[PDB]
């Protein structure tokens, strides 16, 4: 009964290097909305204007570690990128429909994790309105992809993922395990959540555990096959993570 | 060396954790300082201009979850800050004569770690030169505390401290280590050293820790004196803490 705890601070600390990988993303569209720039370019965009921001944008997303940062107009359309330069660039694209872009309008802020269009690429969307006077003028958004902490957490050994109150694998130190399940889920809401996640295609298959047994803690005994591993005795805690609604779980090895 | 993989990994950890929080608050001058209405606040001390700016930093420093972030003028008075409703604002305030203004002034940028003036916060003091033509039109100030941090150290029961290159503890899971050092340093450089803390108070003293055995590891076995007591033993590890000049140092039981 000695893990236990050593695996709840193993996974406090995870919960903890997750939280503050979020907030640094959430800082991007936080001074971005305010920016005169980012403003100006909305109210009265010109060539030059949408250049400036689109190497701004750039620069940011080298520094700032974040997969795209892109600006929204009050339409739906993307007008400047930090992948202008690419053939993937998002500038031009319809994302009206997006609930980064329409949450953002209706609440100032928003955030919503997904599969790229195109990339099929896992990312956390983060997004807030750029007030006009008048109006909305447009929703500026970060995609934070995790691939930083997913290799942190495969450097432990004890593996780990981050799941959505609908029991749902987003985060995960072990690939395979993308987009599986911790909780039950029924016949209604299997293709409404593949929607939104923009990967019609996922398993909602649960994560291969035999065994759970509720330790007093609620923590729980367990057998896992990893990718590898055929079978595997392990120990599975649970921990909040502030300031998401996600949950972390951590097994760890015997 | 069983000690050494548990308490490397979880070291690196921590450091990528305050690489995380150290990098939230990196970007907030970072575009602060190219924003046209923080030029024009510092070209036009207009008041609906300082008005707005106010509470434009309040609710940055407020997500952000900055502690203070204040902007100075060229003659180093400061201007418009988050915390304009407090009896303890800044604005009026000379800061002319600390690093992080002067520094921010002669090149651009500085780091600066130092006790708050009227707080005895310990923090970081990000700051970033406002340019104009005609040259700097002042400085843009985030300072980053980190009391959150040490909390969810003091959680891991492995205390760990960080030191900058002059040996100095400046952020400590232990508070009474802040400011005790890896090396001894001299009497006579103290004063200049107290006087860049802005801490008079700061000791000074060597590390309570002897009977240091380095290992082939790299690390090391120590006895340290735990405020209160006793003398428990411990495991030593260091690591560089990513993208900043600051070192950590995890001590891990035996
Ligand atoms: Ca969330
Ligand atoms: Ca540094």
Known sequence: AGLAGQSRIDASLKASLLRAVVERQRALPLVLADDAAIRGALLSPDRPSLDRINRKLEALATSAEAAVIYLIDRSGVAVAASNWQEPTSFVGNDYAFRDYFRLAVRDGMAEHFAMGTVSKRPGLYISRRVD??????????????????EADWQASGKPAYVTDRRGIVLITSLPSWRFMTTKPIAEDRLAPIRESLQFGDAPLLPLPFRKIEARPDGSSTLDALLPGDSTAAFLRVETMVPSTNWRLEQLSPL
Chains 1, 2 share one sequence.
């Open 132 to 149: 006009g006077p008048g109006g909305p003028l447009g929703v500026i958004v970060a995609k934070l992809e995790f691939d930083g902490v």
